[model samples]
Target chain A: PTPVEEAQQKTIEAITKAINYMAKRRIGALLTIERDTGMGDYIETGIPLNAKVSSELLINIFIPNTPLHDGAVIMKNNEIAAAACYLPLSESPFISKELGTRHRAAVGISEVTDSLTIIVSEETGGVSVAKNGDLHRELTEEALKEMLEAEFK
Target chain B: PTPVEEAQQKTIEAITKAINYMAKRRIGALLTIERDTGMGDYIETGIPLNAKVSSELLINIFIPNTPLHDGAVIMKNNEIAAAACYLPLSESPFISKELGTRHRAAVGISEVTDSLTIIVSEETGGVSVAKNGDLHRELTEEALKEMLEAEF
Candidate 1:
């Protein structure tokens, strides 16, 4: 991967694994991967919280009944740019190890833009991703990184 | 040091090194080392925290202008017992590589009870200790632990 692409891949994978930790503990989360493309449309609605990205910080944001747990966290330039911001949702319904609202919104972001999105179902514990308008389910940690390696190639 | 003495020595040394770090950074700290002979009188005058002993926690407690930063932190039986508690002063005056109020309080604790007290001067950033009512100043990390090995 190019230097820029490498940072993007590493950032997204760190987030994916962090959310995986959240998922294992039944903590729900939504994270959108933004790069050369900006998530300007989604940024305004959420609260801006510029923080260094880390597993500890990510898991804290999505803990049950927390303030920002209900919305998408936009990771920009390998930092947590905002949280509780709205994502453009696909004209779809809703996480039972199944595609639901959060997953659909992720798919919707991929549908319109060249960015990737990850979802950990609050309904049932599982990992999923939406990319290039296509949504995939049950991603193992390795698979998530695998998808990430190819994401920028 | 035997088994029971091993834990005591390790705990005290961990704290000594922690205060050593604090001393290097000019973070003034007072830690009273307690064991078989409890510092019952001293514990009563301070706040009771009762957390597991660690360098991170020790440094945090003694940060300047914080709630617990003004008083002695008594470490009883390898755990943080309390902070911001009063210590009996050793009829002493004041830290600039010279013994002052905090160091005097440490010597006072040693005087009344069978405990070891460590002092890091916020003024001079030196590591010192008082035990058996005798005050010693400017201990290197290795020297502090060496004294600790023989303490118990």
Candidate 2:
């Protein structure tokens, strides 16, 4: 694989593992992956992680009793840039009432920046992805894998 | 004009006047106007202006010997958000060698954000606009006015 493809594969593996682990444990999480738009402004609002990306770290951060569980995690250039970062909430009138704040925030970040967001629901343990002001909820593992491959690869 | 039109007109007039005054004085100025992307991070790097947008204030800020003359000015929602603010420089290989750091910075800001940048060249006493990774150089006063109108 090319270096870029190799790096993307690493990220896919880490994220997929984290999602499965979190879903099984009923842990909720929000992960924002940075793209073309610079996210320095939002990154400043959170506790800087600047660590190597790993499924274990992702799971640990999202564990219910942790201080970092309340806000979003930002991944920049395939590494964790920050944790507990606050994100803007979407004001779109089309948002469904069945969705919660995390879902709205995911869509909100996508609206302002070119970033993509992944959300794992606490209540239903269902997975969702937000990109470009749209949300794809209750994604099967195959669908989620396909989406991540399409984006990162 | 409605209140929205009135506000936009005021902004266009103010910017046009500033550009004309700067060109006449051979003063170089870089101005970035915020759009969809929030510039709160960059705003924190500079001294807050939070002042009314006017030719006099802009001219004074770009006066050669003043401390505020060296960096960029960011406009948020039709008001001067900050002065002497730093902007990223473009690393693209396609950039012309004739363009200096300020011009590169203009392109850099446009690449990363949806903001539009107006550059008053110090050496040439010319005006340029950078948006969406493209630069329109040495624009006529009418062209500049029309562009600003279409944007705001």
Candidate 3:
């Protein structure tokens, strides 16, 4: 990630910071970070953030009762574009019955776009990553960053 | 109110959240979010954060009996760089007579750095902002954000 631009670097770092913190604290959320694709269609459906990236702001929004807490937050490069936006749902025939909407959204967006979606389960606070139409669940923070850094380039 | 970049915008917003919450709970705090200048000198003096900027974490640090509660929390742009860092005492001759150590540090760092420090007075739970060596006191939540949005 050394060669990553400042905005994207900060955005990714803060984004990881938030997920790990929430994972340990059991704060459930669905967050996405864009890589190669521009999330133009997704941004409009959610409350526009378009503000500087910060883990604090992400944590604030994902906590219960926030106006933007109910849905997904779309991260565009180094800034947050929108909140409470709904990601396209995956229609995979192999999708597990045990999985929920959050996981489906995570997988669905990855199926269409080249991006990383992080899921923190409310039931267990376990962290997971979705990308390239694959869901990797119960990942350690070390594994999570490795997955992000590999694709971040 | 505009022109602030991706980093400092939420730094002030979280600080606002922390100040407002602390004010009602009577929790004293010294929170300085960096502007353009480097806060390198102070980072080493306190415990490192490098944390996702969370109001909950900020509140977690400032609550009494917490080891980091007494000193300042230094924010690097939109991130929490460190906590429990001490601010220098101002040597200005005309410093406010009624101001305490907390308010003085609120004034002290601003004199040297291009940053704003939010102070929540313990006794009365009042709010103040220190920047460019000037201290504005007795601010409410709305006034606080108004001041921050203008300068942050």
Candidate 4:
């Protein structure tokens, strides 16, 4: 896709709808996350993504029916905003490295956004955080907010 | 997450095991195919995708247990290599697409080799083929083989 096309794919409206979808959904899930380096240096290497304004972006939603077991997200432009969905994680490969919470985050992201997600656990105050992984930091809702803020900053 | 780590994650032994697991058991499933944009310019455009492989040269395998549906592979690298097991395509989102054939092909590719697949059809196939309405072309065996030959 062209740079303008890419930029057009990202938007606050899209992300807001996704969060609303998640907020209104029921059930949970599991997921798998695999990075795609084949996308090219500009993308894999983190160049400024070029999305065009007024361009049509595709969105997939799966959060209305299943459990919110877990989901995924790639921190694009330093925001928690993303698409959302409600899918059963059983279909995923359950990759060993991504066997737990991160996997759930990835699942969550896919449900919420057009992209797949693998939410990382950040050390923070305790919240309803449920994922599977070995991390050196505490994961609290407050901490998660702080972490996201730090990344965005 | 790390390049070096991802390399070690998809060792031949691991990939082989995943293929074997798919060939041998029964497990429930939840699958998604984002259709277009798993590779190429999609990522460059900032449309992030979380596939099995972080790097193009490698194929990642993750089979926690035996798949609920048994599977088979009849072709690989344009060569006819077939394997059959008890697995079958248990679900299809619609009748017109006939997901049964596609699932067989996906399982077949895994069984024969570590070829990643993205199937596109009317409804169920749409799950993995419609990238921003680009209408990802359904790759034929010839097309797939040529690409493999180029890659290998």
Among these predicted structures, which one has the highest lDDT? Answer: 2
Model 2 residue runs over 4 Å out of place are B1-152
Higher-DockQ candidate of 1 and 2: 1
- List the candidates' TM-scores in order: 0.48, 0.50, 0.57, 0.26
Per-model TM-score (chain A alone):
0.85, 0.96, 0.90, 0.28
Candidate 1: tens digits of C-alpha lDDT, residues B1-152: 58878777667766775777788889888988785677777777765555556564566567675456788888777677767778888863332335568988888878888888888888889888888778888888888788777775
Per prediction, the TM-score for chain B is 0.86, 0.96, 0.89, 0.24
Best by TM-score: 3
Task: List model 1's recovered fraction of native interface contacts, to 2 decimals.
Answer: 0.00
lDDT of 2: 0.82
Each candidate's iRMS in angstroms? Answer: 14.8, 20.8, 8.9, 12.0
Residue range A1-153, candidate 3, lDDT tens digits: 355576556666887898877888787899888877877888788765564566655775677544557778887746667778889999986666677888899899999998889999877898888899988989987898788778766
lDDT of 4 by residue, B1-152 (tens): 77655444443233233323322332111122112222222123222322222111011111122111122222222211211222223233322353546454444333333334433332322322211212224444445334333333
lDDT of each: 0.74, 0.82, 0.78, 0.29
Two-chain DockQ for model 3: 0.07
Model 3 spans with C-alpha error above 4 angstroms: A1-20, A44-70, A78-86, A89-95, A98-101, A132-134, A140-146, B1-104, B110-117, B121-124, B131-137, B140-152
Q: Determine which window of 10 residues in candidate 4 chain B has minimal summed lDDT.
A: B54-63
Give the CAPRI class of candidate 3. incorrect
Q: Which residue pairs show collisions in model 2? A: none
Q: How does model 3 do on interface RMSD, in angstroms?
A: 8.9
TM-score of model 4, chain A?
0.28
TM-score, model 4, chain B versus true chain B: 0.24
DockQ-best of 1 and 3: 3
Q: Tell me the tens digit of each residue's lDDT in model 2 across B18-70.
A: 88888876789899999998888887787665655655456656767444677
Better of 3 and 4 by lDDT: 3
